[PDB]
């Protein structure tokens, strides 16, 4: 009779139809991804169209229920998720232009080919060749040529597209009762209506700043050390007092520093903890790798895999005749159906990635009892964080000795711990200033704090001030240097990696104190501990029904982001970096002294 019962009946009918239609859409997408054939393409297109039309009509019927008279938090959360207009609030011409802009950005990024002048007979694409030439080459001018050519071409073809894109997204967000598109992206972390656990959209940025202020010294030491090692690579081009040259960061954009392990090794004489040779000698196939991962997940107390998971997942490349997407992806098809799309190779990296995707599948498995629209992570960081903690735990030497990959006579001295921690720092700590800089630039350009003709000058200055990386040459507004990254060009939120990075170490400390680990955090294993699995599963079972602050209080006993686990993880590496930065200068200057 009341509005709330009407909302409950509407949500029940929406949940049933949504799970059926979602299952059909996900099955068609799976059939396309494991079998790239044109009938699968048109089936996926038809299912996606029917799914988008279904959510359009259900949102149209859902916006007839005002939220101010609903007191139940779960029904309010489901209706708040359903009533979001997205791009539908605009006129048809502006919406069509926005979709056209997004499609043409996707086609420019996917088919962007940049090659050498005067040799146009064939050219090299970004994904096969430019990543390899950025990660493996040691030539300064070759990397400079590739970097400048790609940024020049992509910036000139993408600058008016981004110019229209920022205005259209700003109009979309202001029509959707948001301050800017950055506020719309920060709305995923918004918690309203719960006493004591309330989190605002505006607070997150200073919270990130509050974490970053304590991130900044450790990164500075790492930056100095990296600079010193790059000084070994390049003798005269890099200045002791200045920043790093932009085209020397090991990737196309500087997002990850993990390609510098060869150049920045602490102890090159010591071997690594790579167990690929043990897998290939003992013939460890992909099925038994996933069985070992399942054994790890039943050691901690989580439920084992379903029969349909083993029957329907394709864990091996099918062959030349059938083409499939090689990207590792965990699929929640709905109706209790969970699959992993992974072209497994016999390596340690694929073993860790298999653990990561099985962590994704376990996270999807735990909230199956929840309603369909709440079957997600509490925020965007939790979903990747719960897989990255499994990737952390599986990579330990104790776990490798436990499962027979590593010999029981292996000596774990401090030097291999230092080089492993430095590799983890280059993978994890390296991406944090780039992520915070990029997100803060995107937030100010959506907010209008940055003037239209001052984008590059502001961006490079922040790269000098935050990341400590200097440009090779000055760039004017004819270039669009941010837009060369995959996430920004295809309308993706970027703060999920920063939040995932913090939640990863927070969850790691919570499980390790739950499992009674008496040593350093990087040696900790969550295997054979039922209590840690129960403590984690308490968060896993909630899904999106509860606020992410409440889930964080359930795991780590704190309701806000904390940076103390990350610095506690890297503490011996921090002491080592303090020891070996006595001769070098910690910190950087914003001047163009290197180049």
């Amino acid at each position: 009779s009341t509005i709330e019962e009407q909302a409950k009946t509407f949500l029940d009918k929406f949940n049933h139809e949504a799970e059926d239609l979602f299952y059909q859409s996900s099955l068609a997408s799976w059939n396309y991804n494991t079998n790239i054939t044109e009938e699968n393409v048109q089936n996926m297109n038809n299912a996606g169209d029917k799914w988008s039309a279904f959510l359009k009509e259900q949102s149209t019927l859902a916006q007839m229920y005002p939220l101010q008279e609903i007191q139940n938090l779960t029904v309010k959360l489901q209706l708040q998720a359903l009533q979001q207009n997205g791009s539908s609030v605009l006129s048809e011409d502006k919406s069509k232009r926005l979709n056209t802009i997004l499609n043409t950005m996707s086609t420019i990024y996917s088919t962007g080919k940049v090659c050498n002048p005067d040799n146009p007979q064939e050219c090299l694409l970004l994904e096969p060749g430019l990543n390899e030439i950025m990660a493996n080459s040691l030539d300064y001018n070759e990397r400079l040529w590739a970097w400048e050519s790609w940024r020049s071409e992509v910036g000139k073809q993408l600058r008016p597209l981004y110019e229209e894109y920022v205005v259209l997204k700003n109009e979309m967000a202001r029509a959707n009762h948001y301050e800017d598109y950055g506020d719309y992206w920060r709305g995923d972390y918004e918690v309203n209506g719960v006493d004591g656990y309330d989190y605002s959209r505006g607070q997150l940025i200073e919270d990130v700043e509050h974490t970053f202020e304590e991130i900044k010294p450790l990164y500075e030491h790492l930056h100095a050390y990296v600079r010193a090692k790059l000084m070994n690579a390049y003798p005269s081009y890099i200045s002791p007092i200045g920043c790093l040259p932009a085209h020397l960061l090991g990737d196309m954009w500087g997002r990850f520093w993990t390609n510098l392990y060869s150049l920045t090794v602490p102890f090159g004489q010591k071997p690594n903890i790579d167990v690929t040779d043990a897998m290939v000698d003992q013939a460890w196939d992909a099925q038994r790798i996933f069985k070992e991962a399942e054994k790890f997940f039943v050691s901690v107390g989580l439920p084992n895999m379903t029969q349909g998971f083993w029957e329907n997942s394709m864990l091996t490349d099918p062959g030349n005749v059938q083409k499939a997407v090689c990207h590792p992806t965990a699929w929640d098809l709905g109706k209790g159906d969970f699959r992993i799309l992974m072209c497994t190779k016999v390596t340690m990296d694929d073993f860790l990635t298999a653990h990561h995707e099985m962590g994704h599948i376990q996270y999807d498995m735990a909230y199956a009892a929840q309603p369909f629209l709440l079957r997600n992570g509490a925020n965007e960081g939790f979903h990747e964080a719960v897989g990255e903690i499994m990737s952390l735990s599986a990579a330990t030497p104790k776990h490798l000795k436990s499962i027979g990959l590593l010999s029981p006579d292996f000596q774990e001295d401090n030097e291999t711990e230092i080089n492993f921690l430095l590799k983890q720092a280059l993978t994890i700590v390296g991406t944090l200033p780039f992520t915070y800089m990029l997100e803060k630039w995107r937030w100010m350009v959506f907010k209008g704090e940055i003037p239209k003709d001052q984008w590059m000058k502001k961006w490079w200055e922040m790269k000098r001030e935050i990341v400590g990386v200097v440009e090779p040459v000055p760039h004017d507004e004819t270039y669009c240097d941010p837009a060369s990254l995959f996430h920004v060009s295809n309308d993706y939120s970027f703060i999920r990696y920063y939040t995932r990075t913090l939640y990863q170490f927070q969850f790691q400390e919570a499980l390790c104190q739950a499992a009674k680990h008496e040593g350093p955090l990087h040696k900790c294993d969550i295997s054979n501990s039922t209590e840690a699995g129960q403590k984690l599963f308490n968060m896993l079972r909630l899904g999106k029904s509860e606020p992410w602050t409440l889930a964080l209080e359930n795991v780590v006993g704190a309701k806000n982001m904390n940076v103390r686990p990350l610095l506690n993880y890297f503490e011996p590496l921090f002491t080592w970096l303090k020891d070996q930065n006595k001769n070098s200068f910690v910190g950087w200057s914003t001047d163009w002294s290197p180049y």
Partner: protein, 50 residues
């Protein structure tokens, strides 16, 4: 699509009772008038077994 179930009913069923009625469930105050739409849903939903 040949297996169906009743999702909406005004009152709970008595023991050993069946309901084969196809009347549109009136969840609000407005009369349904036999036509589905907003706040008027068909009670029998299909068990799409796969």
């Amino acid at each position: 699509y040949n297996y169906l179930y009743r999702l909406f009913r005004k009152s709970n069923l008595k023991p050993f009772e069946r309901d084969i009625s196809t009347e549109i469930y009136q969840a609000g105050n407005k009369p349904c008038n036999g036509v589905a739409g907003f706040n008027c849903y068909f009670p029998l939903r299909s068990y799409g077994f796969r």
